[PDB]
């Protein structure tokens, strides 16, 4: 009567950074997705290619849970075929993606007076990220023609910029915990069906 560890993913004390997003493989277990929908504490529960209600019957071979914290504004960017700073350089969702994006406000969890430095979204990248590709590099960004040489300088900028998370910040700038569930339907064991 194996049960999928959704509680570990959803109720983790600290979520990972959006640039350094955490991917957890879920397999060989029964998952009650409907229980998550019934709680309804999530501001965003958008499912693409599948219906959020009644998806128990469908059987999924490979389920991946991706966890990161972003601003309220960026939640729209976490969708297929969306363009944004977060989409281009931090987390990319494929155009043909089938799965559910779950986001809830975590203002009371991920905020500190004077700002929290942990989240650190990527601000500069040479090229747009490929879908489901993670970059953790801290190499200096050569905006200028002159080489940085590995040191901060005029026209050379650190790639990662820290989100300033404050309790007083507006809902758009407030932290949001986002879990993206990726479902694969193929000819395979389909162990994590979750009826």
């Amino acid at each position, epitope marked *: 009567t194996n049960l999928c560890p959704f509680g570990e993913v959803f109720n983790a*004390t600290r979520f990972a950074s959006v640039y350094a997003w955490n991917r957890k493989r879920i397999s060989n277990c029964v998952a009650d997705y409907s229980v998550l929908y019934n709680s309804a504490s999530f501001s965003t529960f958008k499912c693409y290619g599948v219906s959020p209600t009644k998806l128990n019957d469908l059987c999924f071979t490979n389920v991946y849970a991706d966890s990161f914290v972003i601003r309220g504004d960026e939640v729209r960017q976490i969708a297929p075929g969306q363009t944004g700073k977060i989409a281009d350089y931090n987390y990319k969702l494929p155009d043909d993606f089938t799965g559910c994006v779950i986001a809830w406000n975590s203002n*009371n*969890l991920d905020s500190k007076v004077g*700002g929290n*430095y*942990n989240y650190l979204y990527r601000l500069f990248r040479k090229s747009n990220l490929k879908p489901f590709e993670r970059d953790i590099s801290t190499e200096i960004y050569q905006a200028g023609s002159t080489p940085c040489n590995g040191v901060e300088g005029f026209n050379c900028y650190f790639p990662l910029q820290s989100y300033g998370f404050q309790p*007083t910040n507006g809902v758009g700038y407030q932290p949001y915990r986002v879990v993206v569930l990726s479902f694969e339907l193929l000819h395979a064991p389909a162990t994590v069906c979750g009826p």
Partner: antibody
């Protein structure tokens, strides 16, 4: 293991100046903001000041505002609570904390500061 | 400024009893409340954060509830170790303010 140790607490005269240095170890000092809390003898807790991770932002409670200055050195991993115009009321055990009331919360043992004439 | 009122300060109970400690914020602080337990001559230990989230390494008996201006701390079963001062501190505002203090005492 995150460790905070308070030093520099000692006997002082009223109107004297004392500085308390909060040594930190086991974590990245720059990433986390720091707080100072004082418990007066036979009294409840009283938050004193905050210094942000960047260090530009500093906030002080009125009872110590314009008399206490909070500073930090990232290289030395020490937070300094400069105290000036000390008073008999100021006498307390001063605790240095990291990110109060959050998952990153940590507390030092505390150092007793005594103001006596 | 935000002001925290912690009642009942003089609460007493025997071992195994259910204890409740109520903290009231003067103005809305969302879920930004923390609960601390201070034993005599010891640094405060953070039992609860974010109003209801238990800190790691804290016993499960401690629990928190409430949002907005009203909050509560509940101990399901009292223990000898639990007989200590309890404090509620808001973290929403830039100047943090602690509560008065509640001393759970053996009956």
């Amino acid at each position: 293991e995150v460790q905070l140790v308070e030093s520099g607490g000692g006997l002082v005269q009223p109107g004297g100046s004392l500085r308390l240095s909060c040594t930190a170890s086991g974590f990245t000092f720059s990433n986390y903001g720091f707080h100072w809390v004082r418990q007066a003898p036979g009294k409840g807790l009283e938050w004193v000041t905050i210094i942000s991770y960047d260090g530009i932002t500093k906030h002080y409670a009125d009872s110590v505002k314009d008399r206490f200055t909070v500073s930090r050195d990232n290289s030395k991993t020490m937070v300094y609570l400069q105290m000036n115009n000390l008073k008999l009321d100021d006498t307390a055990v001063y605790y240095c904390a990291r990110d109060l009331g959050t998952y990153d919360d940590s507390w030092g043992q505390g150092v007793l500061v005594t103001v006596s004439s | 400024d935000i002001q925290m009122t912690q009642s009942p300060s003089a609460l007493s109970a025997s071992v195994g009893d259910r204890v409740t400690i109520s903290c009231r914020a003067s103005q809305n602080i969302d879920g930004f409340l923390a609960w601390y337990q201070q034993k005599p001559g010891k640094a405060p230990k953070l039992l609860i954060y974010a109003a209801s989230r238990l800190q790691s390494g804290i016993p499960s008996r401690f629990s928190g509830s409430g949002s907005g201006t009203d909050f509560t701390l509940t101990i399901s079963s009292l223990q000898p170790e639990d007989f200590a001062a309890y404090y509620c501190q808001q973290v929403y505002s830039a100047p943090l303010t602690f509560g008065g203090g509640t001393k759970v005492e053996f009956k």
